[PDB]
């Protein structure tokens, strides 16, 4: 039509674009469905630049699987949001999405106008969330509780052994993280990775590790007791902000001009050394310094003759972790210098690897910042596990965040289904159709679970489709026998908000997705 | 070779029809998009992004064309949108259809000027008509406004969330009233900041008693939570700034160089103590911040933010009532950041945000939009934009109109009453424009999908009785409905410019007779 | 962006149309173009038009079909209406103009009700039944059912209207000459077939000097002399004028000398004897299109006989009928009974063109021929085209009967009758008929457009004057009084039959074109 307006423009139509979009997701869900579920397979990507992936979390796939179909890109965005919200189940989220739209299509393919079904969805989610709200299990921050949940989450990505090794570190971090009210996960979580010696030996360090080393050979590699200097003011030379052209007349002055120029930094370092010497009058104690900017070699020499450990050019967030590590008082002005401003560590050495240098912080009495040092055999795997790690953490932060918890492995969805299928047309009737498919779409999670597990779908669903008695249980599908399972008893759990948001996210996605007619493209050349 | 060398020209009826046709297209491509039963459209921007939106303006604002009057039609949409927000759901669809019949006298060899002449006559009665059939409303009563707003918003996808936005729109609108104009206080929708954050749910988005900043404390030692802070808006930078006169120094003696470097230290510290002398708590500036001073301001345990956008600084200033300063020595305590009920900086999830709540009687506010995805969010706020906009228009005029086409038929027969009493050749144009009006409820029928002809005739038949004027068309039942119970109520001024714009479109395109291309300048 | 999806790649490159949009919009507009293409077409005030064909041939025209014939239109439904009137023209003659006007108008309001939401199917029925009702009410408007078979004056007054419509300038001459033509032809091969008329085109000597002959012509050369005998004795031979060569390859053979002499000699004498036996029958003229023996004409001059040449099958077919003499594939037998007979035959020179003249006086009734004189061959081709239309217009008149009032008044009555019938329909279709009733105004509306006066009150007074049964008064032809004229005294009448079909035909075109909704077009 508007092709009249523009020849080069492109338009779809109500019937046309509708099918296109559902076709688009139907393909999209097909690829990703292999993944979620511990039996699922992570995927490897190759850049046109030749880089390499080994990932399973779909958002990474979607963000990096170069596609042009718009709805997918739209779906990609919310999935990325979900990644910025919780991290996994984005897997399920899209699988929820297209499958809903597929079931949605079935009825409009019967000519049903979509507007009605949306309202059915509107009612459907409400009842579901109503059920969702009540069914979450209020659980304390028992170490094991989260431990199982961490293992519950972490198995989604890696070896059973690998996550199990990983499981201990994250939870203890979580334990060593809270100030009993509010986590931010940024400072206290240091994720550093080394191409070193294994995948499994990746470990929590009770202290901190640094991405660089001292710039002087005489610099002490290892120190028993560390007294910490946290700072950012440059001890490299600097010349003042005003144009300040000087001359001299004598080469003697030239040297006199040599010494004068250095004198300012000379005092700066001098203030610290006296403080160090005011502090470390003992020979046994070792003194360490950290700068966010760089340091003069002459200053380096200044410390060198005093055998002073100092570090330069730190990322702006590290000092927070340092303050969260040693209780050191991060400062700029060294004239206002106090020993109480110091930080203290029980042990420091440096670790040299490859060509780089890595530095080690050890033995805080009550460390409040820790580090997930990632030991790596292979670069992609480090990147690979890291996503699994950050996912695993964000699972826990919500897990602690919510004093309740959802038993995982889709036992909820059947519970959603039966309750939702147990809805009379208290609706205006025509909506009961959309509700029916809405409930129908929910069973995909175990379906693909059995599918990813290889067990036949239809029979297993019917099997687990047995609420037993008055204790019609929250029953999961066994991930290795395809059988009814108490996720709670077996300790398979999930974040309530995860379950919360995804339903909300998908629903809003769905209704608008169904509520477009043609896809316009009339843009400038 | 004479005139302009390959610049095309055309004249007369072919031009006339061509403009007639294109608008017919122009209106047509959107006729699906009005009404509580409307559709919702998603667009390809040329550079890859996606916008999904029902508001016609952006749709047309996102439309590239070659024929001019369409682009001429384009701006008309955005103009009324700019002035009114919505009706863009309808105005153009009114417009082209007006033109659609407007052509019908071109074959009547009637010179358009008279046809214009009747039009100006026609609108005059139309405006007079609506004023007669308008209804003033109290502005203090919240619930009717909320009813008005949902009446105003039960057209867009946020329909499921009417309760939230209605109060949401009302609250921000009410809290923006700048009374230093005497009793001529004026609200602003640019101090009505809108912040869209994905994640969360619609229910999580809320009106914040203050401002939200996508920045962080410069230093950890500054507290991230304060009840009643004092806030400083330093328009100037916090550091040493050029001696503007290409200044130069010639030192000769050794100590001089070291001396000067302290002096900049001294100059900076100077700034610090001037700040603290007013015992402030929070530091905000559009420029950078010296960490060394920030050490000092850390040393004073005084919260500091650097490089903040100016409009926000104003709204921040409008949040806490303080006034921005570029001169620490000339800083004045009348601008102490008092009016701060709570200071905080939360973690949204990968982002710190600055939380400024419970000002006493704040005039500035930002709405926090927390949803699924920004295109969803961006769609929402556009609807919010319309929602708040009409409210101020309601705050601009208390007189209301019943829409749903009810008013439309009211004028329609009214002009018919005028038409038969206004004998002459111009009569036939006059009724024709009345004939044009009838389509909007008709269009509503299709968006519902009902027996349009029968319902319309009955509605006209229904509106033949003078006793009833609020009889309009329900969105969903597609049945004749008096508006009083239905409650789809609208600002009169919304409809005024609607017709005002509609008819302006008509005359402008009608005088056209010619096309000229290839200007080359 | 840059990548929408297709739910059906069924097409390797073609045009599929759907959603009624083309039907509701594109189908209509194309039709509206055709109306705009030929809106000016009909009218004594309607002016002619010229177009060049794809083969760069000139065509000045007022007849829609012929110019329509010159248009390779590519819209499908365009052709439908095109071929519709095309056959309609094949059926009646003028009216092509009218039916197209009917076509657009019927279409023009149709989408309006379609856009108003009236059912396409119901639109079809209402459009259908109203037309049927129109047929019902049509006959009651016949006035002055002119009957005189073989008078010149009646039909001259009659056929003028066809002439005036497509030639407003020269009615008197053109009227008399075809009236001269029509009266000259009687029911002989069955009731004055149009093809019984031949036309000759001669440049120069402007239209006033154009004439009509009670005989027939040939613009061809001659072989011997040129004479007329009032008792013309004609020989007709589809056979080429020479010794009958065997179709089989029969090569003459000799064995001895004396063959050669007698061989050439004998051939001579027999052809002479052949032509002699023809001459003894007194036939002073022999005719053939076929190959001519040279000594024969040598003999033909020797017995002073006229010869006719290279005539196509039609030409002799015409000529055979003119003289009533049977053409002879057999060369020899100049049968008395099957022999030519003409008032006068000769050659004349007109416009520096050799002209073979068969001046005839035929009581039994003859297939006559008309002389076209004037400057522009394009005018001739136009003028004959209008000239032909009257002939068919006459023949259609000659079919049954019943001249009706032209000049739109009848259709003014129609609409009134239809509109009055409209309120007695009642139902959602009542509008459909009412709009269809409204449609007919286009013709006088077009007439006023070609008249160039304000139509609407012209219609109104015409509407006003028709409220009193004034069935014979209609639109005038005058800028001075753009009000009205009484057609009957003006003699502006027309065929019952001609209008009847087109209305049904125009009816048919619309219901067909309205019928389709979604379209498909493979690449050219």
Curated annotation (Swiss-Prot), chain A:
Which domain of life, per UniProt?
Answer: Eukaryota
EC annotation from Swiss-Prot or TrEMBL: 3.6.1.-
| A GO-annotated cellular component | microtubule
Keyword Repressor recorded: no
Q: Position(s) of the covalent cross-link Glycyl lysine isopeptide (Lys-Gly) (interchain with G-Cter in SUMO2)?
A: 249
Modification sites for N6-acetyllysine = 3, 197, 285, 363, 375, 386
Membrane-crossing segments per the record:
none
Write down which residues bear the modification named Phosphoserine: 203
Location(s) in or outside the cell: Cytoplasm
Catalytic reactions on record: ATP + H2O = ADP + phosphate + H(+)
Kindly report, in one word, the top-level EC class recorded for this enzyme: hydrolase
Q: Which molecular-function annotation in GO is an example for this chain?
A: RNA binding
Question: What UniProt keywords apply to this chain's record, in alphabetical order?
Answer: Acetylation, ATP-binding, Chaperone, Cytoplasm, Hydrolase, Isopeptide bond, Nucleotide-binding, Phosphoprotein, Ubl conjugation
Residues given in the record as Mg(2+) binding sites: 88
| Family classification | Belongs to the TCP-1 chaperonin family.
Q: What does this protein do?
A: Component of the chaperonin-containing T-complex (TRiC), a molecular chaperone complex that assists the folding of actin, tubulin and other proteins upon ATP hydrolysis. The TRiC complex mediates the folding of WRAP53/TCAB1, thereby regulating telomere maintenance.
| NCBIfam families for this protein | chap_CCT_zeta, thermosome_beta
Protein name from the UniProt record: T-complex protein 1 subunit zeta
**Name of the encoding gene:** CCT6A
From Swiss-Prot, chain B:
Q: List the disulfide bonds.
A: 359-365
Give me any GO biological process, just one: positive regulation of telomere maintenance via telomerase
Major enzyme class: hydrolase
Residues with Phosphothreonine modification: 423, 452
Sequence positions bearing Phosphotyrosine: 240
- What does UniProt give as GO cellular component? cell body; chaperonin-containing T-complex; cytoskeleton; cytosol; extracellular exosome; microtubule; zona pellucida receptor complex
Residue numbers spanned by region Disordered: 1-17
Which residues are recorded as modified (N6-acetyllysine)?
215
GO terms, molecular function: ATP binding; ATP hydrolysis activity; ATP-dependent protein folding chaperone; protein folding chaperone; RNA binding; unfolded protein binding
Question: Which residues does this entry mark as bearing Phosphoserine?
Answer: 4, 163, 236-237, 245
Q: What PROSITE patterns does this protein's entry cite?
A: TCP1_1, TCP1_2, TCP1_3
> Where can the Glycyl lysine isopeptide (Lys-Gly) (interchain with G-Cter in SUMO2) cross-link be found?
8, 241-242, 374
Highest taxon, organism lineage = Eukaryota
List residues binding ADP.
Answer: 35, 87-90, 155-156, 404, 475-476, 490, 495
- Residues bound to Mg(2+) are 86
Q: Which reaction does it catalyse?
A: ATP + H2O = ADP + phosphate + H(+)
Cite the EC number: 3.6.1.-
Q: Give the binding site residues for ATP.
A: 35, 87-89, 404, 475, 490
The answer on whether this UniProt entry bears the keyword Methyltransferase reads no
Q: Write out the similarity annotation.
A: Belongs to the TCP-1 chaperonin family.
Q: Subunit structure, per the record?
A: Component of the chaperonin-containing T-complex (TRiC), a hexadecamer composed of two identical back-to-back stacked rings enclosing a protein folding chamber. Each ring is made up of eight different subunits: TCP1/CCT1, CCT2, CCT3, CCT4, CCT5, CCT6A/CCT6, CCT7, CCT8. Interacts with PACRG. Interacts with DNAAF4. Interacts with DLEC1.
Q: Which disease is it linked to?
A: Neurodevelopmental disorder with speech or visual impairment and brain hypomyelination: An autosomal dominant disorder characterized by global developmental delay, impaired intellectual development, poor or absent speech, and brain abnormalities including hypomyelination, cerebellar atrophy, and optic nerve atrophy. Some patients have severe visual impairment, dystonic movements, and seizures.
The protein here is known as T-complex protein 1 subunit gamma
Write down the species. Answer: Homo sapiens (Human)
Provide the organism lineage as a comma list: Eukaryota, Metazoa, Chordata, Craniata, Vertebrata
Gene that this sequence comes from: CCT3
Swiss-Prot record, chain C:
| Catalytic activity annotation | ATP + H2O = ADP + phosphate + H(+)
Note the position of the cross-link Glycyl lysine isopeptide (Lys-Gly) (interchain with G-Cter in SUMO1): 454
Residue sites binding ATP per the record: 95-97, 165-166, 407, 494, 499
Q: Which residues participate in ADP binding?
A: 42-43, 95-98, 164-166, 407, 494
Q: Which residues bind Mg(2+)?
A: 94
Q: What is its main location?
A: cytoplasm
InterPro entries, A to Z = Chap_CCT_theta, Chaperone_TCP-1, Chaperonin_TCP-1_CS, Cpn60/GroEL/TCP-1, GroEL-like_apical_dom_sf, GROEL-like_equatorial_sf, TCP-1-like_intermed_sf
Numbered residues of crosslink Glycyl lysine isopeptide (Lys-Gly) (interchain with G-Cter in SUMO2)? 219, 249, 255
Q: Which GO terms describe its cellular component?
A: azurophil granule lumen; cell body; centrosome; chaperonin-containing T-complex; cilium; cytoplasm; cytosol; extracellular exosome
Q: Does the keyword Transferase apply?
A: no
Per UniProt, subunit arrangement is: Component of the chaperonin-containing T-complex (TRiC), a hexadecamer composed of two identical back-to-back stacked rings enclosing a protein folding chamber. Each ring is made up of eight different subunits: TCP1/CCT1, CCT2, CCT3, CCT4, CCT5, CCT6A/CCT6, CCT7, CCT8. Interacts with PACRG. Interacts with DNAAF4. Interacts with synaptic plasticity regulator PANTS.
| Protein's job | Component of the chaperonin-containing T-complex (TRiC), a molecular chaperone complex that assists the folding of actin, tubulin and other proteins upon ATP hydrolysis. The TRiC complex mediates the folding of WRAP53/TCAB1, thereby regulating telomere maintenance. As part of the TRiC complex may play a role in the assembly of BBSome, a complex involved in ciliogenesis regulating transports vesicles to the cilia.
- Disease tied to this entry: De novo genetic variants in nearly every subunit of the TRiC complex, including CCT8, have been found in individuals with a broad spectrum of brain malformations, and clinical phenotypes ranging from mild to severe epilepsy, developmental delay, intellectual disability, ataxia, and other features of cerebral malfunction.
Tell me the protein's name: T-complex protein 1 subunit theta
**Which species?**
Homo sapiens
Chain's gene name: CCT8
């Amino acid at each position: 039509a508007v092709k009249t307006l523009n020849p080069k423009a492109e338009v779809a139509r109500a019937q046309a674009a509708l099918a296109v979009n559902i076709s688009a997701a139907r393909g999209l869900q097909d690829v990703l469905r292999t993944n979620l579920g511990p039996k699922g397979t992570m995927k490897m990507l190759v850049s046109g630049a030749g880089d390499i992936k080994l990932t399973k979390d779909g958002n990474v796939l979607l963000h990096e699987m170069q596609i042009q179909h718009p709805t997918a890109s739209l779906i990609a965005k919310v999935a990325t949001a979900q990644d910025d919200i919780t991290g996994d189940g984005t897997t399920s989220n899209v699988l929820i999405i297209g499958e809903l739209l597929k079931q949605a299509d079935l009825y409009i393919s019967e000519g049903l106008h979509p507007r009605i079904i949306t309202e059915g969805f509107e009612a459907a989610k409400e009842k579901a969330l109503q059920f969702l709200e009540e069914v979450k299990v209020s659980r304390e921050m028992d170490r094991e509780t989260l431990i199982d949940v961490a293992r519950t989450s972490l198995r989604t990505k890696v070896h059973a052994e690998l996550a199990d090794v990983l499981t201990e570190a994250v939870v203890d971090s979580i334990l060593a993280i809270k100030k009993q009210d509010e986590p931010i996960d940024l400072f206290m979580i240091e994720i550093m990775e080394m191409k070193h010696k294994s995948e499994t030996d990746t470990s929590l360090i009770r202290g901190l590790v640094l991405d660089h080393g001292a710039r002087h050979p005489d610099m002490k590699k290892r120190v028993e007791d560390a007294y910490i200097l946290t700072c950012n003011v440059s001890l490299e030379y600097e010349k003042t902000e005003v144009n300040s052209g000087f001359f001299y007349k004598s080469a003697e002055e030239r040297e006199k001009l040599v010494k004068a120029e250095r004198k300012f930094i000379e005092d700066r370092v001098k203030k610290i050394i006296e403080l160090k010497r005011k502090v470390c009058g003992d020979s046994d104690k070792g003194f360490v310094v950290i700068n966010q900017k760089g340091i003069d070699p002459f200053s380096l020499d200044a410390l060198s003759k005093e055998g002073i450990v100092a570090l330069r050019r730190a990322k702006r967030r590290n000092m927070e972790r340092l303050t969260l590590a040693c209780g050191g008082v991060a400062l700029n002005s060294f004239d206002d210098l106090s020993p109480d401003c110091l930080g203290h560590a029980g042990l420091v050495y440096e670790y040299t690897l490859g060509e780089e240098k890595f530095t080690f912080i050890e033995k805080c009495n009550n460390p409040r910042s820790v580090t997930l040092l990632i030991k790596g055999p292979n670069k992609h795997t480090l990147t690979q596990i890291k996503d699994a790690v950050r996912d695993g953490l964000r699972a826990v932060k919500n897990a602690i965040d919510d004093g309740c918890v959802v038993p995982g492995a889709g036992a909820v969805e059947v519970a959603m289904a039966e309750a939702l299928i147990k809805h009379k047309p208290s609706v205006k009737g025509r909506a009961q159709l959309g509700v029916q498919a809405f409930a129908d779409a929910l069973l995909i999670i175990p379906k693909v679970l059995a599918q990813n597990s290889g067990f036949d779908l239809q029979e297993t669903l019917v099997k687990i489709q047995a609420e037993h008695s008055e204790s019609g249980q929250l029953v999961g599908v066994d991930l290795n026998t395809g059988e009814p399972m108490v996720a709670a008893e077996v300790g398979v759990w999930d974040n309530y908000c995860v379950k919360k948001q995804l339903l909300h996210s998908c629903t809003v996605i769905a209704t608008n997705i169904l509520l477009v007619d043609e896809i316009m493209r009339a843009g400038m050349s | 070779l004479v005139l302009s060398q390959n610049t095309k020209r055309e004249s007369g009826r072919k031009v006339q029809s061509g403009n007639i046709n294109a608008a017919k297209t122009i209106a047509d491509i959107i006729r699906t998009c009005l009404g509580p039963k409307s559709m919702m459209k998603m667009l390809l921007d040329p550079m890859g992004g996606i916008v999904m939106t029902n508001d016609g303006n952006a749709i047309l604002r996102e439309i590239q064309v070659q024929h001019p009057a369409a682009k001429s039609m384009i701006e008309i949409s955005r103009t009324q949108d700019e002035e009114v927000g919505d009706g863009t759901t309808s105005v153009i669809i009114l417009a082209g259809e007006m033109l659609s019949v407007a052509e019908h006298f071109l074959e009547q060899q009637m010179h358009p000027t008279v046809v214009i002449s009747a039009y100006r006559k026609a609108l005059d009665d139309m405006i007079s008509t609506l004023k007669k059939i308008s209804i003033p409303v109290d502005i203090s009563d919240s619930d009717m406004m909320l009813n008005i707003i949902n009446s105003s918003i039960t057209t867009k996808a946020i329909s499921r969330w009417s309760s939230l936005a209605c109060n949401i729109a009302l609250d921000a609108v009410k809290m923006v009233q700048f009374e230093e104009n005497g009793r001529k206080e004026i609200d602003i929708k640019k101090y009505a900041r809108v912040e869209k954050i994905p994640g969360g749910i619609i229910e999580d988005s809320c009106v914040l008693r203050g401002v939200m900043i996508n920045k962080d404390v410069t230093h950890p030692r500054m507290r991230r939570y304060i009840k009643n802070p004092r806030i400083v808006l330093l328009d100037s930078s916090l550091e040493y700034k050029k001696g503007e006169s290409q200044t130069d120094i010639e030192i000769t003696r050794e100590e001089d160089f070291t001396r000067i470097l302290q002096m900049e230290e001294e100059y900076i510290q100077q700034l610090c103590e001037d700040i603290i002398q007013l015992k402030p708590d929070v530091v905000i500036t559009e420029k950078g911040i010296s960490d060394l001073a920030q050490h000092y301001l850390m040393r004073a345990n005084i919260t500091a933010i650097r490089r903040v956008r100016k409009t926000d600084n104003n709204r921040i200033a409008r949040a806490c009532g303080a006034r921005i300063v570029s001169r620490p020595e000339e800083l004045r305590e009348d601008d102490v950041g008092t009016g701060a009920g709570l200071l905080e900086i939360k973690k949204i999830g990968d982002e710190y945000f600055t939380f400024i709540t419970d000002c006493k009687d704040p005039k500035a506010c930002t709405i926090l939009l927390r949803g699924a995805s920004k295109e969803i969010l961006s769609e929402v706020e556009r609807n919010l934009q319309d929602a708040m906009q009409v409210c101020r228009n309601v705050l601009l005029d208390p007189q209301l109109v019943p829409g749903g086409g009810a008013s439309e038929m009211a004028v329609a027969h009214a002009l018919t009453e005028k038409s038969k009493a206004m004998t002459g050749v111009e009569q036939w144009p006059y009724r024709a424009v009345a004939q044009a009006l009838e389509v909007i409820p008709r269009t509503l029928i299709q968006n519902c999908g009902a027996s349009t002809i029968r319902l319309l005739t009955s509605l006209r038949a229904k509106h033949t009785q003078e006793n009833c004027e609020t009889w309009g068309v329900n969105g969903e039942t597609g049945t004749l409905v008096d508006m009083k119970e239905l409650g789809i109520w609208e600002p009169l001024a919304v409809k005024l410019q609607t017709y005002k714009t509609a008819v302006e479109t008509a005359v402008l395109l009608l005088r056209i007779d010619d096309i000229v291309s290839g200007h080359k300048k | 962006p840059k990548a929408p999806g297709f739910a059906q790649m069924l097409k390797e490159g073609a045009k599929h149309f759907s959603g009624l949009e083309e039907a509701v919009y594109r189908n209509i507009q194309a039709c509206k173009e055709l109306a705009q293409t030929t809106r000016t077409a009909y009218g004594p005030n309607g002016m002619n038009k010229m177009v060049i064909n794809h083969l760069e041939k000139l065509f000045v025209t007022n007849d829609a079909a012929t110019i329509l014939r010159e248009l390779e239109v590519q819209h499908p439904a365009a052709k439908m209406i095109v071929m519709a009137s095309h056959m309609q023209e094949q059926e009646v003659g003028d009216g092509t103009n009218f039916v197209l006007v009917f076509a657009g108008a019927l279409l023009e309001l149709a989408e309006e009700l379609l856009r108003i939401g009236l059912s396409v199917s119901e639109v079809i029925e209402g459009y259908e039944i109203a037309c049927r009702k129109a047929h019902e009410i049509l006959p009651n408007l016949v006035c002055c059912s002119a009957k005189n078979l073989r008078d010149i004056d009646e039909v001259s007054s009659l056929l003028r209207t066809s002439i005036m419509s497509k030639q407003y300038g020269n009615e008197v001459f053109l009227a008399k000459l075809i009236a001269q033509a029509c009266v000259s032809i009687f029911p002989d091969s069955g009731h004055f077939n149009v093809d019984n008329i031949r036309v000759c085109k001669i440049l120069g000597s402007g239209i006033s000097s154009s004439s009509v002959l009670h005989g027939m012509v040939f613009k061809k050369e001659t072989e011997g002399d040129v004479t007329s005998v009032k008792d013309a004795k004609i020989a007709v031979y589809s056979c080429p004028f020479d010794g009958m060569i065997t179709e089989t390859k029969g090569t003459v053979l000799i064995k001895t000398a004396e063959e050669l002499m007698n061989f050439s000699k004998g051939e001579e004498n027999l052809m002479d004897a052949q032509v002699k036996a023809i001459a003894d029958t007194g036939a002073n003229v022999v005719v053939t299109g076929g190959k001519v023996a040279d000594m024969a004409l040598h003999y033909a001059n020797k017995y002073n006989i006229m010869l006719v040449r290279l005539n196509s099958k039609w030409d002799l077919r015409r000529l055979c009928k003119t003289v009533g003499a049977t053409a002879l594939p057999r060369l020899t037998p100049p049968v008395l009974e099957e022999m030519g007979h003409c008032d006068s035959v000769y050659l004349s020179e007109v416009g520096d063109t050799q002209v073979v003249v068969f001046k005839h006086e035929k009581e039994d009734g003859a297939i006559s021929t008309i002389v076209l004189r004037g400057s522009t061959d394009n005018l001739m081709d136009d003028i004959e085209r209008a000239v032909d239309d009257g002939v068919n217009t006459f023949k259609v008149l000659t079919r049954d009967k019943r001249l009706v009032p032209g000049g739109g008044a009848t259709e003014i009555e129609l609409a009134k009758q239809i509109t009055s019938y409209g309120e007695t329909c009642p139902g959602l279709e009542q509008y459909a008929i009412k709009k269809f009733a409204e449609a007919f105004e286009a013709i006088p509306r077009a007439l006023a457009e070609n008249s160039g006066v304000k139509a609407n009150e012209v219609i109104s007074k015409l509407y006003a004057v028709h409220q009193e049964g004034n069935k014979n008064v209609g639109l005038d032809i005058e800028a001075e009084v753009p009000a009205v004229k009484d057609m009957l005294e003006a003699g502006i009448l027309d065929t019952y039959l001609g209008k009847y079909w087109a209305i049904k035909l125009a009816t048919n075109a619309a219901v067909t074109v309205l019928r389709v909704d979604q379209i498909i077009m493979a690449k050219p």
